[PDB]
Amino acid sequence: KTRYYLEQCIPEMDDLVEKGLFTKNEVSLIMKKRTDFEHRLNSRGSSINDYIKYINYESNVNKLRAKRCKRILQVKKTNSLSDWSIQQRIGFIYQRGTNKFPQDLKFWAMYLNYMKARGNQTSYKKIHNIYNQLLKLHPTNVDIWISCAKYEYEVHANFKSCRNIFQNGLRFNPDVPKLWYEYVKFELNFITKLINRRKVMGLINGDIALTIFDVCMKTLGKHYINKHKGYYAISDSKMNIELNKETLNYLFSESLRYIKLFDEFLDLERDYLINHVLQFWKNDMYDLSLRKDLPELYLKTVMIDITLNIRYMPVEKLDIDQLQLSVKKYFAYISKLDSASVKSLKNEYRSYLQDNYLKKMNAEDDPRYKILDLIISKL
């Protein structure tokens, strides 16, 4: 049905000749190249590169028409079919290309970027339709879910819709730690903006994330057990213990990422947020105790707890009492740890104090320096 596409361009060509922008000879050249592309798309063996080439060709024709309008007509916009004809046509090629090749994420991305650029011409509702259709074809690609989540939180700032995106995406892909990470990142961004707006309100006059964290920890554990086991359960007790250990280390690294995430957000009470994570690991999980089965992971937990109170204290505002509390915590854990663990926990704590505080303090002017050096010597 290549010819039917050819008449649809006739009204545009007649408008171009009528406005004088393009001569009949030149317009004939345009029609000849469009004819070749239309044959290429409708023939067998057609590929996405053919659609990209035709879209690129039409874009150049749009540029040439625009400049000839100012050059010859001397008008920004001539009220005729020629103005929106190319832009409408280019969208049609995208629709045909995406439908023909739903696999290619590359063409979908160009489709969305092309229309988001022309926000005035293309309503945001149509953008939702494309994201809707794309999500249905690829529900398991977390990148798409975040893309519409990001677009509707930045361009439109509709937090309600963006939450539904994350809720729907996590429903389809609860085993992807990345999607949970971004959803928490979105959750903290909303609180930080909300509190900043509250601060602005006064001038001119969060636990919810932790719940997302907790469920992320459980669901990721389940799927990691579902994987590494296949269809059947593992009969041997020792292997089942190894699978439990794999989840703990896998989850512990994931939880460690959320600890790193908390540091970015200054407004929130990071110590309170981190303490909840520490409390989560203090609970026995999968019948394995961190102190007994994974001392190396336990040591990192102890180190964070010991340095929790002094983690965010700047060198200028260092409180001796808070430092004493940190040391008091450090001594308490030694009495319950083995000799090898104590040496490892020891060396780490000395480096932490030396790098963060001792190296950044002037030895001659700060009286706290001698106390830090004495504490470092005694530890």
């Binding site: 994420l105 590359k106 979908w108 991305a109 160009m110 969305l112 970027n113 690609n141 990148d143 798409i144 975040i146 893309s147 989540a149 990001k150 939180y153 971004e182 990142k185 979105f186």
Partner: peptide, 18 residues
Amino acid sequence: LETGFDALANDWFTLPKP
């Protein structure tokens, strides 16, 4: 929120013969 999607844009049954 980081998404690569935008960055992505730019014979067995034969007997022997005697």
